[PDB]
Amino acid sequence: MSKGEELFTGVVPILVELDGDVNGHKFSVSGEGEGDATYGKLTLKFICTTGKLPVPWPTLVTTLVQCFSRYPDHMKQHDFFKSAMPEGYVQERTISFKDDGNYKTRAEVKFEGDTLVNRIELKGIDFKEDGNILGHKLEYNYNSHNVYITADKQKNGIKANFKIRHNIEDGSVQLADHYEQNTPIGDGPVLLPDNHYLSTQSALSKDPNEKRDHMVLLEFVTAAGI
């Protein structure tokens, strides 16, 4: 394993801070919780601190800390994310909603003292004002998915490509194509993995005593494929 892996052997508090602008609809989200990478386990609560979230919460799940994935011992030389810690990594995505707009996101994931922090900027353009996203037509749930990871040695990082299918309230599906790049922030060596994937399962819920717009998320992420 990497030196950074040692930072994740116990429960680590997590902070997420997102500033977004989708078709000019601005919003911010704050999340708090903890991760226990030994179990690939994340428990987080996200709050829209600016009022109503102008997109569906499920569309932000992939943007809202892959360093908490459980890498099987036989695969730990393939865990880029922890290997970049504590200096961190920059995750860049384009998320293309079929027949609608796209998000572009830039996230910096790094330790601030003992807290793993994910700071994100999200920009969404070319959405339909009464499409599935800005019209809030997506169910509040989330299917299991695989994230396929490949090295990008020339960039000293990794890439991923994957499809998320959000459930539309009419029974159909809203595809969100994801293209992702992750690059280290610091200078230290990182682990550049062989091809593999992350298997993710996510449960979305609500805090019955919370009046703000929010999402409670229980998520498990486990590496596989090698």
From Swiss-Prot:
Signal peptide: none annotated. The keyword Transcription does not apply. InterPro entries: GFP (IPR009017), GFP-related (IPR011584), Green_fluorescent_prot (IPR000786). One of its GO terms (biological process) is bioluminescence. Changing I164V: In P9; increases fluorescence at 475 nm excitation. In R10-3; matures to the red-emitting state with excitation and emission maxima at 555 and 585 nm, respectively. Green fluorescent protein has been engineered to produce a vast number of variously colored mutants, fusion proteins, and biosensors. Further generation of mutants led to more stable proteins (at 37 degrees Celsius for example) with brighter fluorescence and longer fluorescence lifetimes. Changing A203V: In EBFP1.2; shifts the excitation and emission spectra to shorter wavelengths and increases quantum yields compared to BFP. Photocytes. Changing Y39N: In EBFP1.2; shifts the excitation and emission spectra to shorter wavelengths and increases quantum yields compared to BFP. Changing D152V: In EBFP2.0; shifts the excitation and emission spectra to shorter wavelengths and increases quantum yields compared to BFP. Changing I164T: In P11; increases fluorescence at 475 nm excitation and at warmer temperatures such as 37 degrees Celsius. In Esmerald; leads to brighter fluorescence. In VisGreen; leads to brighter fluorescence. Changing S199F: In H9; increases fluorescence at 395 nm excitation. Changing Y142C: In mut1.9; shifts fluorescence lifetime from 3.03 to 2.74 ns. The keyword NAD does not apply. Changing N143I: In ECFP; leads to cyan fluorescence, folds faster and more efficiently at 37 degrees Celsius and has superior solubility and brightness. Changing Y142H: In mut1.3; shifts fluorescence lifetime from 3.03 to 2.78 ns. In mut1.5; shifts fluorescence lifetime from 3.03 to 2.72 ns. In mut1.27; shifts fluorescence lifetime from 3.03 to 2.85 ns. Contains a chromophore consisting of modified amino acid residues. Maturation of the chromophore requires nothing other than molecular oxygen. Changing I168L: In R10-3; matures to the red-emitting state with excitation and emission maxima at 555 and 585 nm, respectively. Changing Q66L: In RSGFP4; increases fluorescence and shifts the major exitation peak to 489-490 nm. Keywords: Chromophore, Luminescence, Photoprotein. It comes from the Eukaryota. Monomer. Energy-transfer acceptor. Its role is to transduce the blue chemiluminescence of the protein aequorin into green fluorescent light by energy transfer. Fluoresces in vivo upon receiving energy from the Ca(2+)-activated photoprotein aequorin. Belongs to the GFP family. This is Green fluorescent protein. It comes from Aequorea victoria.
